[model samples]
Target: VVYTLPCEDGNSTARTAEIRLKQATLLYGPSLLGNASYFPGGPLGDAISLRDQTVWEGAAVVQSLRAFTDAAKVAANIKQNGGLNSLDDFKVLYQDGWKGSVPQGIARGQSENYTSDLLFSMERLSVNPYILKRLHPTEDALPFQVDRATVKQLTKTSLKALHAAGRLFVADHSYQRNYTRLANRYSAACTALFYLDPRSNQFLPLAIKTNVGADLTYTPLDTDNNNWLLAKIMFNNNDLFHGQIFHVAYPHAIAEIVHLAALRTMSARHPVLALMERLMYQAYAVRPLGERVLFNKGGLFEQNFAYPQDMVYKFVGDSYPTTGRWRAGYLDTDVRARGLVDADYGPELPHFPFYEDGSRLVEVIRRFVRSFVDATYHESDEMVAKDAELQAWVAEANGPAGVEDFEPGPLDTRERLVEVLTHMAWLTGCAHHVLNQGEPVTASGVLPMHPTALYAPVPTSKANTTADLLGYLPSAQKSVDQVTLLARFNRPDVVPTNQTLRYMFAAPQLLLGNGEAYRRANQRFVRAMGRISDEVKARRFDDRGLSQGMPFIWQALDPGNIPFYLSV
Candidate 1:
């Protein structure tokens, strides 16, 4: 018989047994089937095991334990302070609780004042605008109630006119159609309409749909402060769930697939591998552990999410084919598809931080990929076609084991290779950075603002009080778990300036060996990022304002701090 839980802690020995058996099963037995397809060939492929337990395992365990300890302390603090009575209590927790190092400056949204509505608008524009879409009012009937007269009053234009001018927008979480309800807590798939205020460049919500019927809708015009605030809170809750699964977890999986294909097909010294390997750092290591602890049944997803843990993965995977960012392979492509940016209509729309900052970072990565490919494949177009290893990797990527929906189209051309590699780098690096660290503004730091699970039923009318709203906020334990999980994962251990960043241009001699052309190209890439980082730093400091009661800036994609991989 195999012995598990060999550690003898006496009374507490039973407490650790389940985790020990799970670890034993992963380390010595078969890995999870979710990861089985890409393996035998490791995340870095070949017969090599994906784990470096001495390093990754230790770090992961420490992080989990640290989060738990922090969460426990925060819970104790809440209890000692007479338990959370209002949303303002989260501010106290922000200072001395589990919110961790992610930014928490947007606390103005915690108020009951009318100006708090503007903070709601700013949060979506800069923090988690992945779901923001253009609303064609003429074609797409309003899914919920909206007083067109109020829309006209707010923007000096009717709904149809705003659509004509490309100013009408929506953050529709209606796709979160299914969720499991636990006692006293529930999740919702809601929708909200937002209009860009030309005077302030703020995208303010015009209407909110808490449920399917118009009778359950709310707007900024509501006399009861809690009615409007609760609607925004619930809408944000839907976005919080969507952003975690689709934005954070999805890219981690995609990067692992690409890493697996490259390792299996390319030789140790392949030029493509040499160029792209830095971005592949830790892509393999996190997903399996995430599955075992975070995404598994009875895991964090089950604990806090509206749906069960497995269904979260199901919705994320299912939605990817139609709405995923990877298919277009460029930020411009994806942004344009969502109608947020276009030459003819974009000037009419407000400046979007997600599009503006995201496009800038994407361009830098594109330039690096283009320069590397142009130099490496300068010999001939025939060289691309004739490179058997390169062909094999692309073929593997299109198959069942890789990003199964990835439309690589003829990897035989030079531009094609650049596009593919650019998409891969952006997905795992910059995009992942924004989604993971954006937690504070959107959900974690302000737990009551965007709860994972609400404590009371959705009010049927606008006759609710502050007590009713506070009652709907997540309980203290759920609040602790939400902040703790996000804070633990959002920690960035390695960055561009760090000595530990050890790949690509950061450690050229080690990763590229002695190639003069590659070294020169990498120097250009590194210098470019350095300059951009400085600009990002300057803007981050200068851009803060109370113009809309939002002293926030989009520094999540600052190249200086973005990790080269999806380690978290």
Candidate 2:
């Protein structure tokens, strides 16, 4: 028989299990997927190890546990506390009562999934006697009944802290004095992120990505994990940016579409999951450039923009360091020169605009503005090696109406030109969404975003130990080194989150791994959503908000050029 429990040491890869049969007894060691860790190991041995705190892994573990939370209580508490409380409730939840033995600044490994553990423990508690007999065989029902309501309260409180900690949520007690960490010394806000599917027995698996230097910023945006925020999504695909994780966050209309076919609490939990997906996918899930378009010249997958800020500053004819202070791609060479320790993300090269304020998203969004951005900023010869289509798109502006017409006003300011290009992409991209209308499917098919946006995992051999990757940015190599040493090598089938894209679309089959009977139910969901898409075709939602009519694109024309998606 097999049973799974996350480690208390709180490592994602540090999963522990016990295997028993008629013959042999096997034991599992510390893996990255557990909680309550300590490196020194003592009675007063703190909860989280300095190792985990070094990269905020322990904090992420806390959010993972928060993932299974119901969130209503947490939202309520945030309002009551004026916003973002502390770990008091969770401290009580795990400790059973409020003795508060757990240190104020301590948490264990993979604590990310702590609440999920509570629910699953309860699941084991509630199983039928007969099923329990066969499943555990020797195991007995947990003695004290777990208080569901109390758990909710604790979860809600945990969420408050997470929200309050936004973009700077690490639990490390040491760095609080730093200017970066001090930025939030008195901040209180609540994104109210929680992960749970109350009606379902399964755990809500989250996907998140942590960009280079991303630790400097934390706990907000399309979502995070390494940054130690909650994951609205988690993918296993080893494409361009596979290692990153973020939960699938759909907008209101998309959530409603998904809710139409959902079961029990899944539908009720719509807004919670929606937030994660939206934070994670909202702007990113732009469907137009999915499959074929993503790999093209403007495609964002497997490549890097390197300098997104250049658009705003470059047009002003300003350059950095005169090319002498730093080498070619001075941005790359000089960052490390400053005390921006671990400036390099990896050998593969980090992508620009890791955090998507850029009006970025949907690999399509990246593609949309790229050609224009490049034309104005780059040399003619630079793009020649890129794409013929890019060349054509760039040249299209040369002669507006006639063969020799020169369109001067827009490009001159580069301001008007920038606005014009992105807006064109914004509106045309909306058109592209309606470009296809067969049936309802998750954004996956509609948006063939290279599952790995920039988190592309580059394989290593003898010359490359895990340090090649772990040495920079997030400082995660220790665990990675341990994992690479432990994980079976060179079999593509190990990670399955990519193939199971259903989890991201906000469908009820949306959890961490493996689903089926849920699959047929999901087909029903797809069709139900397709009907909604069909309505969009009828011009039913021509005047909809940013999230509605997703598969059909935003058909409404902009009266003021500030599109619906960016109105907020």
Candidate 3:
């Protein structure tokens, strides 16, 4: 026979015992399933055997009695207070009533299912003070009609049975509320030996360990703190009340475990489960470089330059020239210095222009520009490395010039600068070739061109005395002209290879001097403007007056050079 009883401390226990019987069949016996028909007088009657009673009959009788008492108390309080006006007023009455009746209900129904469910629901809704009072009420206020001693004896016997079965874990009070009593009780029973052993100094299960200084911290054992708790509850219990408990406890556990894991391995590998670790690491490392550059520069240059600046308008547009500062290839030196180049290559040996003396503002602007280019190049390189054709094309175009064999011309500043710009333009052309293919390139692929350009120089007209170095002039022209040339490169009719090739070989003096025309016009504008008060100090100016000014007249003379001459 299986017999279940309710413990005095608000839990349940089951015990099995063998019963000897004569070989005569009785009229009926208790059904093993504990169906309604197995009770003494159908579902409404008392249970025939303790094991066949409902959970309420066995353990929740006290809760139901408490509910009845609470209902009465609430009625009295409502009457005393001119009817319940608020939930708070009703709460006080309900608490007082439940405390007086819970033990009486439990003692009467031993194992009745309907009664137990009702009691459990009532216990769940009440606050802690009321629940505690229901479980351990004062002897004088007890509401049961039965003798106090008899009720105590029955409760003691049931509690002992539960303790012997290792079911004491249910009484664990670590949960925030009485929310997880039933499950905690079950877990406690399963691992009761842990609590009973002398070596088990901690009252919690062996699976839970507290840090030395965290002795006061509390956590439930049945939770899965890393995942959804309500899902777990639905999975484990399926029933409404138990399911709610499971849901609450599971999430609580998940949170606890996640928090512990985070504390223990905060510096360990990131939890990007979908990505390959090494690839993820490389991606993470490279991602920040691009982000830092973008964040510092405000945003991508292609996007930034498209917007109009008020400063440009105030300065008559011509005074604030857009100097390709945000242009991709302009900031190579700064990019290299910021250590953005691929680590596979040894650190880039610092070179001129990068090391050139400049003001802090220039340096900052230069660094931002270079960083932008480096980030773009890195992206380009990644794309090129993936495509064999693109890789071969870049290698061939940028391969060493082998200039060692040619008799070196005098290495003058303008010559050096032109050479540098020419080499960079060539590299830029190669990069454009790849970029134009409509393939995505990472920043690494695009950044190297900037450094290559920084190493090349501009050639002076005097340095073009030698016939062999004459090609250098067109190269220099092409370097500066490529800005506008490449902008229109895709328009074949506008920028034919025939025109580009011709321009590359022609001497600077013969090509209509359009590039110099622009340069000199800018120089004249600067000289003329130098005579006026610095524009920074000018607070206000009417359009009519400003336009009639001498500086404005000179600026209007060559409107085409306006964008080129602005100091900004």
Candidate 4:
């Protein structure tokens, strides 16, 4: 079923609307006008093609409806009483405004600035076709036999064009926060619908993607109830609150260790590996001493290895200028008795957890790679599904006792198709993170800085340095720190099993383990809650007395601590 906003202002909000049937409905199609006219790109075409456009259109619809309905609700409440006159009067009627402004201020601006920005940003959220081809190079492009390399080149070209138009940067700034924030909001909104009716849970996965744009659309192929629930919880708790620090720290550690290992083993020989090493080095270059203290000190006790401050000076060269330097005159002499790698003055070393075998750390990278692959595959599936014409063709051909009673198409098995597609989407997300981290950055070019840097002064550039080409080395360094942390924590025997690393490295295992972890965690939380109770709680208790007398005894219990009796 579909619902749209009221046309009170004589403005129709809906661009298009339609409904389609599943196999069960196909049996009753004739009675319900199922043999509907198939207008080119009309409602019939759209209805049957919903599975494809579900994510993009679904999200957009939901968000629009929410905005319109919420506004209407507020307006109705105000009209039932008296109309709002001033800000103060409005606050009395709508108390929420006292704490914050109305919800859709940005969305309803006069210029429709927010709406345009949102739509434009949404356009860029598309999955890269080349990335999909890279996943299944041998398989014919499901709906079309387009060349994978050509698609990739086209995608890159598109990005360059967008970048030149200055839209990419604007989009990057806008959508970065949108994904970080609104993705969860949309999830929560969809979950609320499921809460209203548990049966709706089956549709929750698709419903959540409904209101978004084409670029942001996704499909779920293999829906692990546990993983889906975990995603729900994580989205609600971590992503919603932006409290991903704990989760991020683990991966940062792993990345650091793996990175350092590559540096020690491959150095400048392996181009890709060397680039990862160089990026890691630059990220760690000028961190605060306190940040390094943990890694340096922790490594000594845990791995029995000590690195001296002077090591930085030696590696960077004697002629290299140091902005923040402190002499280690007296400390240098005492270092002989203590277990330290160097004695002289230099930058403080980071205290990273050192691994002996390096296998545990390697596993983290493995998981990251796997997740990347899975996400990519899912993205391609979604793209295929979004092709309305393709969906219509498939539906027509596969209809019961219709065109042909032949074997089904590749996507005929909805369950399996969705499973592959969802994994692809997830893997794509993972791959993007890892590849960006591992890619090389040269110092001699214009480095793209984070928008947050607008409020802060830009750092001084170094000569012939690759760091300059990469804006915000500190942020990249933080990512390395997170990767390193994950590697150390993954240690094969570690509890919780460094799932982040596992997910990234061993995609399949990570997928399975993640589902199990969510189930276990949810079960534990549910079991711990014990039982639900029904009781009527009173806010206050009063004692009444006659007021005719000059004085009368009256007692009242504290409202804060009033206890309620439970009947059941």
Best by lDDT: 1
Q: Give the TM-score of candidate 2.
A: 0.17
| Superposed Cα deviation of residue 135, candidate 3 (Å) | 31
Q: For model 1, what is the alpha-carbon lDDT of residue 45?
A: 34
Question: Lowest summed-lDDT stretch of 10 residues in model 3?
Answer: 437-446
Q: Which ten residues in a row have the lowest lDDT in candidate 4?
A: 559-568
> Backbone clashes per model, in order?
1, 63, 60, 67
Candidate with better lDDT, 1 vs 4 = 1
Report the C-alpha lDDT of model 3 over 385-494, residue by residue, as the tens digit: 34322222223222321111111322222222223333232222222222221111111011111100111111122223232212211122222221221121121211
Off by over 4 Å in 3: 1-26, 29-66, 72-95, 103-203, 208-568
Candidate 1 achieves a global lDDT of 0.61
Better of 2 and 4 by lDDT: 4
Q: How does model 3 score by TM-score? A: 0.14
Candidate 3, residue 131: the lDDT equals 11
In model 1, the runs with Cα more than 4 Å from the true position are: 1-49, 52-55, 68-81, 96-115, 137-139, 199-201, 212-215, 323-325, 343-347, 399-409, 437-445, 464-467, 495-504, 508-514, 539-550
Q: After superposition, how far is residue 16 of candidate 1 from its true place, in Å?
A: 46
Residue 403 displacement in candidate 1 (angstroms): 3.9
lDDT of each: 0.61, 0.22, 0.21, 0.22
lDDT tens readout by residue for model 4, 1-568: 1111122112232211111222222221220101211111234323423433332343334433443444445455556546533222322222321111112121111111211212111111111101110111122122212234432342333322322322111100111222222111221111110101122111111111212222221112213222222222211221111111111221222222223222222212222232232223222211122124322433311121112323222322221121001111111221221212131222111110111112222233234333332332333555444434334433543452232122244343334333322222222223222212111110000011111111111212212222221222113322222222221211111113322211222233223433344334333322322111011011122242111110111111111111110000
